[PDB]
Write a structure and sequence with these properties.
about 85% helix, rod-shaped, mainly alpha, about 30 residues, 1 helix, homohexamer
Chain lengths: ~30, ~30, ~30, ~30, ~30, ~30
């Protein structure tokens, strides 16, 4: 249960990290 | 037990990493 | 079920993170 | 057993990673 | 099963992520 | 067995990543 819960939080953080790195990538093109 | 505790620490570090990257994205724009 | 699902989403997010970092790496050379 | 130890090492590396991104975030501001 | 496949893709992505961050580290000196 | 092995490779990769991010932080100062 808790393991499942932590993993969706981990999953959600990685989605956010994924989004931010795409934006960083896009910006570094200039 | 320990696996759960490690996973909670992992989850928390990742929120911190997510936040810093938000700030970094904002600074580079 | 849910753990596998989260792990499957974690895997997809890291593929995206990997690709974005390649793009950033490419940009810093170029 | 081995699974827990890997997770505790994973936890510590993510803490190091979080701190470094804090540092990076500060410099880019 | 599915968990194992997911952990290996993750393991593989992190190797790539590691390589890219190394290239980034290298470029940022000059 | 395979789960344990994957987690150990995950742990080692996170160590490399931690090392890289340290180098990146220093150059950005």
């Amino acid at each position: 249960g808790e393991i499942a819960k932590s993993l969706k939080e981990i999953a959600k953080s990685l989605k956010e990290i994924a989004w931010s790195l795409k934006e960083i990538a896009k910006s570094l093109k200039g």
